[PDB]
Amino acid sequence: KEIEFLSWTEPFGIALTLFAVLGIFLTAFVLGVFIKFRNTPIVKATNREL
Amino acid sequence: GCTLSAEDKAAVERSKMIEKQLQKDKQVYRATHRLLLLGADNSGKSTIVKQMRILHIFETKFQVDKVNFHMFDVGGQRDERRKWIQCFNDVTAIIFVVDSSDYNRLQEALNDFKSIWNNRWLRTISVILFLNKQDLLAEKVLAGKSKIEDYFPEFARYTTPEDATPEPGEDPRVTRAKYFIRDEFLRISTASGDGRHYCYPHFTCAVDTENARRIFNDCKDIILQMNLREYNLV
Amino acid sequence: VLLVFEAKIPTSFHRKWWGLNLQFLLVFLCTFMQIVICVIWLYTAPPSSYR
């Protein structure tokens, strides 16, 4: 019988992993901007610890 | 209670009443804002404290809406011997009343403001700068009797700053002199500061009943800023 | 931010490191209710893969 699951090698799974990696990298980029500007007024206003 | 201390329980009840009164007074004391009213005698601060008496031992209890204010009103002047700046230090604001009409004493007012703004005892506390008796300054500038150039040298090359709030119909020369006198104090206020305290400037006259609301707004803004940098948000 | 902007009272003067700590504790309490749900689940009847 054909074994069915959402697979990593499946193209839809490939796209889903690419989107997750893109989200992870966008979040990391936002964190990097928030850290290279950790003393700017905007970053202070939006609670930088939280 | 124990050991049949008959009079001691009455003493405890007395202390309970006294502590209740003190706790009740604590609410008013904590809620009441504290103001240090500095300035020379010629500044006209007598008129403004009279106005506070009208609209809510040199004290001043005035209640703007639901918030109380206490002015200690020590002179803090060049000559006055009220060296109680170290005492009554943790105050909400400093009210620095200045007689902008008198040019000769205006430089001494500059010196007093410099001393107050640079005093490390009052570094945290901001200044509610009431440039008072402003109408007589308007009359003086309207005529050619006295000029700013007489005492302050750099009255020339001074254009009225952008967005320096016009008053409909007010003489442009008077407005230029007005904002020169104000920015002259803001020049001192800028130096020797990490942004901890701001010299809230206001143009006032001895026939102004809104000074209480100006003090209310500046005190609310001061509390807001101090909370904001205390929680690390500004 | 709301309690900073709605202080008709004087300066809060929330001294010590208890400010950021208070933030983290409140966050932890919310996540703590969620974690209690989670542990009760995964200990009583945990999920399982099923062909």
From Swiss-Prot, chain C:
Homodimer; disulfide-linked. Interacts with VCP. Interacts with ARRB1. Residues 1-21 are cytoplasmic. The chain crosses the membrane at residues 22-44. This is Extracellular calcium-sensing receptor. Belongs to the G-protein coupled receptor 3 family. It comes from the Eukaryota. Expressed in the temporal lobe, frontal lobe, parietal lobe, hippocampus, and cerebellum. Also found in kidney, lung, liver, heart, skeletal muscle, placenta. G-protein-coupled receptor that senses changes in the extracellular concentration of calcium ions and plays a key role in maintaining calcium homeostasis. Senses fluctuations in the circulating calcium concentration: activated by elevated circulating calcium, leading to decreased parathyroid hormone (PTH) secretion in parathyroid glands. In kidneys, acts as a key regulator of renal tubular calcium resorption. Ligand binding causes a conformation change that triggers signaling via guanine nucleotide-binding proteins (G-proteins) and modulates the activity of downstream effectors. Residues 1-21 are annotated as: Intracellular loop 2 (ICL2). Changing K8A: Does not affect G-protein-coupled receptor activity. It is found in: Cell membrane. The gene is CASR. It is linked to Hypocalciuric hypercalcemia, familial 1: A form of hypocalciuric hypercalcemia, a disorder of mineral homeostasis that is transmitted as an autosomal dominant trait with a high degree of penetrance. It is characterized biochemically by lifelong elevation of serum calcium concentrations and is associated with inappropriately low urinary calcium excretion and a normal or mildly elevated circulating parathyroid hormone level. Hypermagnesemia is typically present. Affected individuals are usually asymptomatic and the disorder is considered benign. Hyperparathyroidism, neonatal severe: A disorder characterized by severe hypercalcemia, bone demineralization, and failure to thrive usually manifesting in the first 6 months of life. If untreated, NSHPT can be a devastating neurodevelopmental disorder, which in some cases is lethal without parathyroidectomy. Coiled coil: none annotated. Changing I9A: Does not affect G-protein-coupled receptor activity. Ubiquitinated by RNF19A; which induces proteasomal degradation. The extracellular regions of the homodimer interact in a side-by-side fashion while facing opposite directions. Each extracellular region consists of three domains, LB1 (ligand-binding 1), LB2 and CR (cysteine-rich). The two lobe-shaped domains LB1 and LB2 form a venus flytrap module. In the inactive configuration, the venus flytrap modules of both protomers are in the open conformation associated with the resting state (open-open) and the interdomain cleft is empty. In addition, each protomer contains three anions, which reinforce the inactive conformation, and one calcium ion.
